[PDB]
Q: What sequence folds into this?
């Protein structure tokens, strides 16, 4: 039963590391997009506050 | 002679019963130790197999 619990823990760790390894899948893409798609003057208008 | 024979027979019976009980206790202790060692080895092997399966 403890081995089954440890297997479930390893599955949860893999699920968490899927997002942890998705740090490079999102951060670099967002940086490149902000360098290219955002370009300059992409500050919108903070009229609400 | 009857008193001496009765005393000797009682002593021999007590010694034989004590020896039989000691032998039974030793056999039971050895069996329990062997079973515990086998159970520990089986649990270790099962844990290693479970870790390999998880990996």
A:
């Amino acid at each position: 039963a403890q081995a089954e619990q440890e297997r479930i823990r390893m599955l949860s760790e893999a699920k968490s590391q899927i997002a942890d390894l998705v740090t490079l899948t999102a951060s670099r893409v967002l940086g490149a997009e902000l360098q290219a798609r955002g370009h300059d003057a992409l500050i919108a208008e903070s009229l609400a506050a | 002679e009857q008193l001496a024979n009765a005393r000797r027979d009682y002593e021999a019976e007590i010694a034989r019963a004590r020896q039989e009980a000691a032998k039974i206790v030793a056999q039971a202790q050895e069996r329990a130790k062997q079973q515990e060692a086998e159970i520990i080895a089986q649990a270790r092997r099962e844990a290693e197999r479970l870790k390999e399966e998880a990996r």
Summary: Residues 2-54 of chain B form the longest helix (53 residues). The CA atoms of residues 30 and 36 of chain B lie 10 Å apart. Chain B has one helix and no strands. Chain B touches chain A through six residues (CB under 8 Å).
